[PDB]
């Protein structure tokens, strides 16, 4: 029987147009007055994030504010505009201001709370995930926070979801992973017999769908799928 539902963080709580609007703000701050325009960062900085978290699946862990950082100074050098040493700090206003939860999210995890533990699961830093979490008004949703940061490897690795597991009390075939990229998030819970949840609000996706077991495109979903299995 399922007794644990867990998350990811961005791509599953945060809507895209929140993600979008608070980077674009980000890259804003970061330049202007610089004569390049923010969302041509914003789109580069997207991609070679992209890539990096790529090379870094299942990986060891490695700060995500150093990777991010990383990525920034490549840009900076890139383009010719000052690397902003306090990227992370802008990074942290923005997203607290403009960043949005789905529609649904407070509804799915208020409808879980006492009824199943309800755990994130997040290749973020510790620092960011609290972050995201306080910023956003989501934090007391959550019976465990786990992350990269603790587990010492990013998703797809077992160890992420062993540690959620073992903070819940729980063995993998008693929760789901709920998550936005079906290798990273679907397989890597599957792989500790998690159930796996893709959500794919746009059907984007439809190329890795068989890495899941269940798609959703609305987070409401979800409790319907648990009460179902149960």
């Known amino acids: 029987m399922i007794r644990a539902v867990f998350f990811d963080s961005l791509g599953t709580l945060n809507s895209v147009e929140g993600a979008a609007k608070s ?28 890539e990096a978290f790529s090379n870094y699946a299942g990986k060891p862990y490695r700060p995500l504010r150093d990777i991010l950082e990383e990525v920034m100074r490549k840009l900076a050098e890139k383009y010719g505009f000052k690397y902003p040493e306090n ?29 199943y533990h309800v755990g994130m699961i997040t290749d973020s830093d510790t620092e960011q995930a609290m972050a995201f979490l306080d910023a956003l008004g989501i934090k007391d949703l959550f019976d465990s926070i786990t992350t990269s940061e ?10 992420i979801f062993e540690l959620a597991l073992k903070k819940a009390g729980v ?60």
């Open 23 to 50: 980077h674009l703000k980000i890259m804003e701050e970061v330049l202007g007055d610089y004569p390049l325009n923010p969302k041509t960062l914003l789109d580069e900085y997207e991609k070679l994030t992209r």
């Open 171 to 230: 063995k993998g075939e008693e929760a789901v992973y709920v998550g936005d990229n079906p290798v990273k998030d679907c397989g890597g819970s599957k792989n500790l017999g998690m159930t796996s949840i893709l959500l794919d609000r746009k059907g984007e996706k439809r190329e890795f769908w068989d890495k899941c077991d269940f798609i959703v495109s609305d987070l409401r979903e979800v409790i319907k799928i648990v009460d179902e299995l149960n």
């Open 87 to 115: 990227f992370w700090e802008i990074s942290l206003r923005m997203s607290q201001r403009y960043g949005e939860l789905y529609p649904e999210v407070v509804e799915v995890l208020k409808s879980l709370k006492g009824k």
């Open 150 to 159: 603790e587990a010492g490897f990013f998703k797809p690795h077992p160890r």
